[PDB]
Design goal:
Chain lengths: ~140, ~140, ~140
């Protein structure tokens, strides 16, 4: 796709990543939930879906788009995790929502039932979105 | 680490130092902002975060790179001439950082630049910090080999 | 020494180091020769010369580059595959030799790699030393202006 497009995608993945790192930094400072690693088995229980992209033009781009559409959903489902994290979460959601539209333009949920469920769901969705955007850049770089 | 990943990195360090030195030489040439020591007090005024420098160290390179990707995007092209110079330096930083990220997987592990003078001077100081950052990164990669 | 010339030198220095680095990682990854130190015996046995390092030093750097064009040529492309990569490295060292010389002007100032294992392992050894020769030219030009 054009280089202008790929650089547009980078600016965006990097903004969404700086937001995700602000979230992750709050969840660690405020709840000591600092190691996504430790929560890996809870993602089961929490029933967090996975967006596949590594083994993936338009079909791939559609997959990125779906995966983004999935993360704006999950973020929404987290209902802001706590009053103090609410702002942070809104910023990351408006941002994932933008990247989702750059992709379509170019084409042209769980129940986190508790304080603990919202927090651990928070850490894991922030971590799964990081990895996914790291994979979306490598995939787009391979399509430019 | 695998010596071949190490050799792929030592290559990407130099390819970024090249683009960096190219930006610096163009800024000096087109605008006469030739000495980062004349703009250092101003690095403080432009709110620039200097980035410090297995798992933890590979993570500090990756964080450093991630900061440096921020600062470069914030200069928004600097000027119509320097535009493509900056576009190559971002795609190269972004590729190096992806390389550190993919290997940490396998192993299992802002300033705003208000005016044209701020974008110009900003380009001088960040090309300049990224240069040293990367040298020290060429030294600790040797060491974590 | 004019700060502009000196930043054109840094970009040339990083350019040749990146080509150096390009060759190393291809030799390490095509023929698993990933360590100069495991070849210091072959190198001693070939008796290969390494170059030492305003007028005087500027002239030492110029003659140092001359030596490395010499050594790079003797490798006779290493393999068909590695051909282009060495041509670039030759040409980029040539550029930089010229630049240095031109500065001198406006201021008024081979072993035989008899074998195929020898070309590949002599590739690893020259690229590695060149890399180190150029970092010090990077520091001497740094302290020169």
């Amino acid at each position: 796709l054009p280089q202008s497009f790929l650089l547009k995608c980078l600016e965006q993945v990097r903004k969404i990543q700086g937001d995700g790192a602000a979230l992750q930094e709050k969840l660690c400072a405020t709840y000591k939930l600092c190691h996504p690693e430790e929560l890996v088995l809870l993602g089961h229980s929490l029933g967090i879906p996975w967006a596949p992209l590594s083994s993936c033009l338009a079909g791939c781009l559609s997959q990125l788009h779906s995966g983004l559409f999935l993360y704006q959903g999950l973020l929404q489902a987290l209902e802001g995790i706590s009053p103090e994290l609410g702002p942070t979460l809104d910023t990351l959601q408006l941002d994932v929502a933008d990247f989702a539209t750059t992709i379509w333009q170019q084409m042209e949920m769980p129940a986190f039932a508790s304080a603990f469920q919202r927090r651990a769901g928070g850490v894991l969705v922030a971590s799964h979105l990081q990895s996914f955007l790291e994979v979306s850049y490598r995939v787009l770089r391979h399509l430019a």
